[PDB]
Subunit: 140 residues, 8 copies
């Protein structure tokens, strides 16, 4: 390996696995408290899934749904509930690969920049999903 | 967005787009000097493609080949020529998704840790591909 | 293998292959009685296909259509005819991977919880598809 | 929904999300103690991923590698280190979709039957990966 | 091999390769006469592509577009121009895998039953595409 | 629709859904008699899956394995146990998409020509899988 | 190899890698001047990606978005901002594989015929993306 | 559209659709003369399929097999029978995406450079497949 240096290098910021896990677990716990069955994903700004947790009894569609919501939230640094509303004036946003413009994903930032998204799916409504996503973010 | 802080955060190091582009271009130029027609990819340690360049006249198999070689080199922090030899004692390494254990990818490090791979494909041999990959890394 | 125990374990409920097959066959028979040509799928709540049957003369689009309808019905524990109507107020539900919000899938429960979906496709209308799906469920 | 009953129903056994998470976390912790950077997956016998955790600094190939190892271990109820050796007399086992016959996955049972696999990838050898997988299973 | 017999067997009807080729070529020729650049596909009722022809200068999106139109036409035994209009009252028809509800595919029958679809893409409008598809069918 | 006629048409022969189902069920029953847990697929010579049945307790890898074995057997009109042995002198046969050169698939013919393959997976050996596949074919 | 000749041959025109790279780099530079973080792709009329550049800090959805926009622009020889408006009277255009009908892709021609598309994604609006795409084309 | 000029442009050479079709048809005819049932593909050096023809009675694996052989032959400008032999000293060549290192593909050149590959599959041996591929090339 050549070693790069130095004006050739840049840094990015991430949740640690420990922090992403804590947040994911908090979202599951919040759903469980309410008798809901959800899957939860935490996705890095660099578009990698860091944590997934499939709740007991969660619907089989919820796992990928949670992942895509998280990816979508971190991509636009916005809750997916709000992003869904953007489809009114830009309906083809939802044609972008890997996205899901449906309430339940919320971003997490560091220094004003998005670093992760937390996505939840499996509750009876996207708005409830997003409540639990926010509960996961809240522990950070 | 919740803002994370701070023991909850970690940093990683990357080539800038400028540096990845310079390296990719150098690999193409080295092949072109020799009358070779190659594709070149630079892939981050976080497994994202940063740059691709498809050489004039490069075979159609070369584009994905270059990408996979780069990914493989950065995953193991080793030239793919050497990694290919590991298949003698661990033949199922090559079953790992997204990999290509074939000469032509080389890693680039920062602070001793892998940060990118440069992959080249399209020359008459993997060893020549890897020569041009090293020529790209050499400018960093 | 470590053996897990015991507060660490939970149970889920499923149709037996025998029951899923009986239901699938009944849906085909109901379509055949009417001179219709359908494919039928039974999909578990855990999102696995348990049975598929491709009717003689069924259109080539019907096989995957039936599978996706079944998956969709068991995911929301609701007939897909009704789920399709939810798209009026949540249009991006249909962006969830693996789903098909089109009449012809119906859920089957045990103890109040969804355990399988039966999906039918290939009839001249989704409503007819769903008639045959219900005929399959009816034998359980 | 028709409600099924009763000779038409069967039960299966699973790790709870709580147990799968505890095991995954233990595998990560064991790797971290040794200064290793791994991804960990827990996959149910019904072939669904229940938990994934991407270690800080883990190679980008490790995430899918861990998932596939877990799936492979639970499919044959055997450590993937041993399964790899079966390729000597059945070399096309590795052509089965979704599999990875490479040390690092280990099964977990309940009542003598496989219920989950734990897969680890990212250490310098499959044998080390499998050490950490066993450390995760050990807490169950 | 066991040999099946006989109440266990059924027959289906197909275009010969010779006939499918003649039709595809006629569609290309009709487009070429008009200075249009199209791709053409003939897809069997059993959902297999029998012939593809990529016109000189045809857009890169046209090849798969033609295939999907042909598949869609033979699946519903109707021109895709008409099928597109069905989306007004069944908008999720277009979520069925492998389909394209866009003018340019037309069915071919034998004994009243659909046996193939011919699909064309690459002209300035779907209606023109479908003109050339009909020109291909017309030689049968 | 243009109607084709007549030197433009050819016929092919198939198992009826009824026959394919009978055979699949017989293979499952033979495995169940022995306390084995298998998936079974019947695939037409035209490469379409006609029937799948997932046995109670069958490993999650078995479903696709059974499908691919059936496809492979009907493609070469030979048991996959024998086809696997061909890899000695043509090792890249197994690189052909959709194939699985592993004991457990067996062909069924009509008029000397292959019309279907029956594939079984999930038993402790491919040879046992193929025993149950033959038991399914035997009822035809 | 047989050598073809000569009425059997035709020529097509392309951007050189050098030109495609210059254009891609100009689009990135234009975004960077404005403090925007984008990915840029140049896609040939024959539907191959020639260059990709992932901007520092660009969202993870931007890379594929840029590629698809470029492909879409070169397929119809029109800016994707305008193509998006065509969805009003042909809504299923967007069902064509590989496309993205969202502002940010612009075509480049030679002799009146499209030879490449330049696509940009990652800015706060498609219209801004398309500004930077035009800035890349402008250097040619 | 910006119009590019001129040191920014390069040309490539291709078979016309007419020539590719003539060659494909000749390969089918040669197989048919011998009572063989094959699929045939012609793939451009730029990696696009130009023509496919599925022979009456051809195995379902033959269609993709023919396509991949053609792609492989044009990528290395060599018959796939010879390329297969290269696997002895570079066994991971076959891990390159989209390839099939199995006799039956042959290249076609213009001005010494590869412009297309013709691939055939479905005969009882790769060597016979390649005979028919050569018969198709021979008419050019
Ligand atoms: Fe509730
Ligand atoms: Fe040379
Ligand atoms: Fe091998
Ligand atoms: Fe009818
Ligand atoms: Fe829509
Ligand atoms: Fe170490
Ligand atoms: Fe025109
Ligand atoms: Fe046993
Ligand atoms: Fe801004
Ligand atoms: Fe013969």
């Amino acid at each position: 390996p050549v070693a790069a240096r130095g004006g050739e290098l840049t840094q990015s910021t991430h949740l640690t696995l420990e922090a992403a896990t804590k947040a994911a677990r908090a979202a599951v716990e919040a759903a469980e408290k309410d008798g809901r069955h959800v899957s939860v994903a935490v996705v890095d700004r660099n578009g990698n899934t860091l944590v997934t947790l499939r709740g007991d009894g969660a619907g089989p569609q919820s796992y990928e749904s949670a992942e895509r919501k998280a990816f979508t939230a971190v991509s636009w640094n916005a809750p997916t509930s709000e992003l869904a509303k953007r489809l009114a004036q830009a309906p083809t946003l939802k044609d972008i690969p890997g996205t899901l413009f449906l309430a339940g994903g919320t971003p997490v930032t560091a220094k004003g920049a998005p670093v992760a998204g937390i996505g939840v799916a499996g509750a009876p409504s996207g708005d409830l999903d997003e409540q639990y996503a926010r509960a996961g973010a809240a522990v950070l």
